[PDB]
Amino acid sequence: RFGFRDSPFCTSLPRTIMGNDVRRISYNVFSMMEDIDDVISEGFILYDAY
Amino acid sequence: SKMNVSYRLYIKTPACLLPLSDYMRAQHDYVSPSSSRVYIKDPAVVYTRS
Protein backbone atom coordinates (compact mmCIF):
# COMPACT_ATOMS: atom_id res chain seq x y z
CA ARG A 1 0.00 0.00 0.00
CA PHE A 2 2.77 2.44 0.94
CA GLY A 3 5.07 1.94 -2.04
CA PHE A 4 8.08 0.95 0.04
CA ARG A 5 11.01 -0.86 -1.56
CA ASP A 6 11.18 -4.39 -0.14
CA SER A 7 8.71 -3.52 2.58
CA PRO A 8 9.41 -5.28 5.91
CA PHE A 9 5.70 -4.99 6.77
CA CYS A 10 3.21 -7.79 6.12
CA THR A 11 -0.53 -7.48 6.62
CA SER A 12 -0.33 -10.66 8.69
CA LEU A 13 2.57 -13.04 9.15
CA PRO A 14 1.88 -15.81 6.62
CA ARG A 15 0.51 -19.11 7.86
CA THR A 16 1.97 -21.03 4.90
CA ILE A 17 4.83 -20.26 2.51
CA MET A 18 5.29 -22.27 -0.71
CA GLY A 19 2.44 -24.54 0.35
CA ASN A 20 3.90 -25.48 3.75
CA ASP A 21 3.36 -23.98 7.19
CA VAL A 22 6.06 -21.66 8.50
CA ARG A 23 8.04 -22.96 11.46
CA ARG A 24 7.52 -21.22 14.79
CA ILE A 25 10.26 -21.15 17.43
CA SER A 26 10.12 -19.49 20.83
CA TYR A 27 12.85 -17.09 21.87
CA ASN A 28 14.06 -19.24 24.78
CA VAL A 29 14.52 -22.30 22.56
CA PHE A 30 16.06 -20.14 19.83
CA SER A 31 18.56 -18.65 22.28
CA MET A 32 19.58 -22.13 23.43
CA MET A 33 19.99 -23.60 19.93
CA GLU A 34 23.37 -24.80 18.68
CA ASP A 35 22.28 -25.72 15.13
CA ILE A 36 20.88 -22.27 14.34
CA ASP A 37 22.73 -22.23 11.01
CA ASP A 38 20.72 -25.18 9.69
CA VAL A 39 17.39 -23.84 10.97
CA ILE A 40 17.91 -20.29 9.69
CA SER A 41 18.56 -21.57 6.16
CA GLU A 42 14.86 -22.39 5.76
CA GLY A 43 13.47 -19.37 7.62
CA PHE A 44 11.34 -19.33 10.76
CA ILE A 45 9.06 -17.22 12.95
CA LEU A 46 10.14 -16.02 16.40
CA TYR A 47 7.50 -15.50 19.08
CA ASP A 48 7.01 -15.77 22.86
CA ALA A 49 8.83 -12.46 23.39
CA TYR A 50 8.19 -8.73 23.14
CA SER B 1 89.99 -67.95 54.31
CA LYS B 2 90.28 -71.64 55.22
CA MET B 3 92.35 -71.14 58.38
CA ASN B 4 91.50 -67.75 59.89
CA VAL B 5 87.72 -67.31 59.78
CA SER B 6 86.28 -70.02 62.08
CA TYR B 7 82.61 -68.93 61.73
CA ARG B 8 80.35 -68.14 58.79
CA LEU B 9 76.85 -66.77 58.24
CA TYR B 10 74.56 -67.70 55.35
CA ILE B 11 71.41 -66.03 54.02
CA LYS B 12 69.22 -66.58 50.99
CA THR B 13 70.44 -64.86 47.84
CA PRO B 14 68.91 -61.36 47.59
CA ALA B 15 66.62 -60.99 44.61
CA CYS B 16 68.11 -57.60 43.71
CA LEU B 17 71.17 -59.40 42.32
CA LEU B 18 71.15 -60.67 38.74
CA PRO B 19 74.00 -62.54 37.02
CA LEU B 20 75.37 -60.72 33.99
CA SER B 21 74.41 -63.59 31.68
CA ASP B 22 70.73 -63.15 32.62
CA TYR B 23 70.45 -59.53 31.49
CA MET B 24 67.32 -60.11 29.39
CA ARG B 25 65.36 -60.56 32.63
CA ALA B 26 65.92 -56.84 33.26
CA GLN B 27 64.23 -55.70 30.03
CA HIS B 28 60.91 -53.98 30.69
CA ASP B 29 58.43 -51.72 28.91
CA TYR B 30 57.25 -48.23 29.86
CA VAL B 31 54.41 -46.46 28.05
CA SER B 32 54.23 -42.68 27.70
CA PRO B 33 50.99 -41.04 26.55
CA SER B 34 50.92 -39.24 23.22
CA SER B 35 52.34 -35.72 23.13
CA SER B 36 49.29 -34.62 21.12
CA ARG B 37 47.18 -34.69 24.29
CA VAL B 38 46.18 -31.32 25.75
CA TYR B 39 45.41 -31.11 29.46
CA ILE B 40 42.59 -28.80 30.54
CA LYS B 41 43.25 -26.24 33.28
CA ASP B 42 39.98 -24.29 33.01
CA PRO B 43 36.78 -24.96 34.98
CA ALA B 44 33.48 -25.81 33.33
CA VAL B 45 30.76 -23.17 33.62
CA VAL B 46 27.10 -24.23 33.75
CA TYR B 47 24.39 -21.87 32.53
CA THR B 48 20.88 -21.75 31.14
CA ARG B 49 18.88 -19.29 29.06
CA SER B 50 15.43 -20.34 30.30
Which geometry of chain A do the CA atoms define?
extended
Series of H and E elements of chain A? EEEHHE
Instruction: Write down how many β-strands of chain A occur, each being a DSSP E stretch of 2 or more residues.
Output: 4
Tell me which protein chains meet in the greatest interface and how many residues each side has: A-B, 3 and 3 residues
SS-derived structural category of chain A: alpha+beta
Tally of alpha and pi helices of chain A: 2
Proportion in β-strands of chain A: 15-25%
Strand order of the largest sheet of chain A: 1-2
Distance between the termini of chain A: 26 Å
- The helix fraction of chain A, in percent, is 10-25%
Rg of chain A from C-alpha positions?
13 Å
Major sheet summary line of chain A: 2 strands, antiparallel
Oligomeric state as shown:
part of a larger assembly
Organism (chain A): Banna virus (BAV)
Protein name (chain A): Vp2
PDB class: virus
Keywords: reovirus, intermediate state, capsid protein, complex, virus
Q: What does it look like?
A:
The structure is cut from a larger assembly and holds two copies of chain A (50 residues). Chain A is an alpha+beta fold. Chain A has two helices and four strands, in the order βββααβ. The radius of gyration of chain A is 13 Å and the shape is extended. At the A-B interface, helix 1 of A face loops of B. Chain B: This is Vp2.
